Write a protein that binds this ligand. Sequence first.
Ligand SMILES: O=C(NCCOP(=O)(O)O)c1ccc(OC(F)(F)F)cc1
Ligand SMILES: O=C(NCCOP(=O)(O)O)c1ccc(OC(F)(F)F)cc1
Ligand SMILES: *Cc1c(COP(=O)(O)O)cnc(C)c1O
Ligand SMILES: [Cl-]
Ligand SMILES: [Cl-]
Ligand SMILES: [Cl-]
Ligand SMILES: [Cl-]
Ligand SMILES: [Cl-]
Ligand code: NA
Ligand code: NA
Lengths: 395, 265
Amino acid sequence: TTLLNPYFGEFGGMYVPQILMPALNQLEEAFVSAQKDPEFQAQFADLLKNYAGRPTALTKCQNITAGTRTTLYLKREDLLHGGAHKTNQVLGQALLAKRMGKSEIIAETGAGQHGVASALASALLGLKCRIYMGAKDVERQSPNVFRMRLMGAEVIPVHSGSATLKDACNEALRDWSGSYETAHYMLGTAAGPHPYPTIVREFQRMIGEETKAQILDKEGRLPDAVIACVGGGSNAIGMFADFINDTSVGLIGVEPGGHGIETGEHGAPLKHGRVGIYFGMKAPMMQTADGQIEESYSISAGLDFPSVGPQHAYLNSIGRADYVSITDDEALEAFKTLCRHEGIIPALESSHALAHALKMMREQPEKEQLLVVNLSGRGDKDIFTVHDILKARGE
Amino acid sequence: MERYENLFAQLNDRREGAFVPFVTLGDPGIEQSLKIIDTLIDAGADALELGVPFSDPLADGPTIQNANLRAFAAGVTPAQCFEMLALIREKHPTIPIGLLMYANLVFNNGIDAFYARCEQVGVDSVLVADVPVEESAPFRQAALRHNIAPIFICPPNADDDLLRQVASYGRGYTYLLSRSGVTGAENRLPLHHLIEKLKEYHAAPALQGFGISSPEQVSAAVRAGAAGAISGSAIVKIIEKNLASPKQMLAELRSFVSAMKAASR
Ligand SMILES: O=C(NCCOP(=O)(O)O)c1ccc(OC(F)(F)F)cc1
Ligand SMILES: O=C(NCCOP(=O)(O)O)c1ccc(OC(F)(F)F)cc1
Ligand SMILES: *Cc1c(COP(=O)(O)O)cnc(C)c1O
Ligand SMILES: [Cl-]
Ligand SMILES: [Cl-]
Ligand SMILES: [Cl-]
Ligand SMILES: [Cl-]
Ligand SMILES: [Cl-]
Ligand code: NA
Ligand code: NA
């Protein structure tokens, strides 16, 4: 029994050991209560405004569309405190944890972005934060690890399995199954067992709400399409949600194509995986032929997650949203182009969304189209990655 | 076939509890795992619980996490596990065999096809670790259609609704969980209320598991009214400690199981 529907069509659900169901049911009840509580909403709105910096700008990018019939706006989540959209929902989940009387936060992280977001929300709201990170990811994300530690979070390397994100995920769940009476599991994307895909969407939906208001103010009509990268699905569903009922607005999610779909080295389970049951959910995932969970790949660590949120799989199945992929090389070109022609350094995650908008423009330059790209983060963190690749290829 | 029912009737006739070891199929290799299982039976195991190596065993502590990796290091696949299961049943016609599965391995090539394969090799029960009773309908229906008992966890905090669901939906035995957290012999209380209400609701006989590592825990569980006890990590620790000595591994396994099985009389 649940208060809300745990499924999006065939996808989603609550596929956790029995011992964790009370924790999920408690969380769903607290969320439903909080969503009805004006004082909770006012507290959340106050943090978003006065601490995180909402509303974020909606920036028209004149130089990169010159000579075409594309009008391109960037929704500037790169300007949010922490430099990525993740801050929105960790503030809401931290307030939920407090509403439940929890004084400890568990979080998983692969690229270290959600780890930093969880750590900053925990520092602000006086929560003891512990972060599980696969030991391979600890090694290659030393800047984000140091940020988490500066913010007082305890970072715990995970050496089991493949020592990366899914293995940190397991360890977070193992911890929570014994500690949920005092700890809240602050899951980092719009995936996992119900109620998380729903909570994370609702705590990210101001991205699309603001975008709709801002584009109506500036253009007097809705976008032709909104475009967002998809690692787990949170920034994309945050942009999409308020447009789902505006059936003329295209919703385009961009998975990482890595070295190319045909190489198998990619992060595009929604279009090129197979439905499985893992991560607490029924969803497309990258897996072996006999059902072992596989390794994904992207130049962008924040997109390097071998499954996807169940609402995205559902919106695809009914045709409401379309999902595409963008390769490392395409994302790198979009990264360089935004820097040089708009003076904005985009996150390599977000560069995947930008690259697909650039393709939409360039393929059909006389097509009238009003596009919004969700610029989910800034790319200061990526400049060494981009430098090293550009140097190895002689640029 | 009704192997749990025959075993429990026979144990009840002898005023005796079941002792049920858990091991990972193919840990540390296929040939040694077959010998391990034959030794556990030869030492007095009443039934078996057998894990199929999975990439992400999120309900398992370090000891069984490591067994999975040892099995993967030997190239063990689910297909090879089912070949092993068929041979085990062929050697041991009456011992109940239960699998401990993660959902994706069951769902992977079709839920119905998985339970059909269990029936064909002679498996008696399946516990899917990450399928709570609330999500269990397609799994328990496929199980029952193929004469497989679906096993459900009854956790410490079970409210009355969960007790009624577990009693109504489970077969073979009820897995009575001794605590929260994950598996491991490093972390160790059968409440008479759950055991009583399970009997009141005509549940399958209760086996206690998680942390069971000493003979007096086996006797404590039977005394509380459970029909027996399951021990996992404690057995797999013996495998881990004696990897370099295959023969000493079998002998220490023989002694521990005999000790635990004696505690249930
Ligand atoms: O992708 C996930 N985490 C986001 C990590 O963000 P980053 O720090 O940028 O890697 C993620 C985490 C948990 C999850 O479900 C479950 F908990 F069950 F495993 C599914 C996806
Ligand atoms: O039987 C099991 N393990 C062996 C005995 O446990 P231990 O003696 O503590 O290793 C066992 C049973 C269930 C399980 O997952 C879940 F609880 F969710 F269903 C994981 C392990
Ligand atoms: C984590 C992250 C993403 C991908 O996560 P989603 O949940 O898919 O949004 C995208 N952009 C940035 C900047 C990120 O940090
Ligand atoms: Cl609000
Ligand atoms: Cl408490
Ligand atoms: Cl409005
Ligand atoms: Cl496909
Ligand atoms: Cl019922
Ligand atoms: Na993904
Ligand atoms: Na990867």
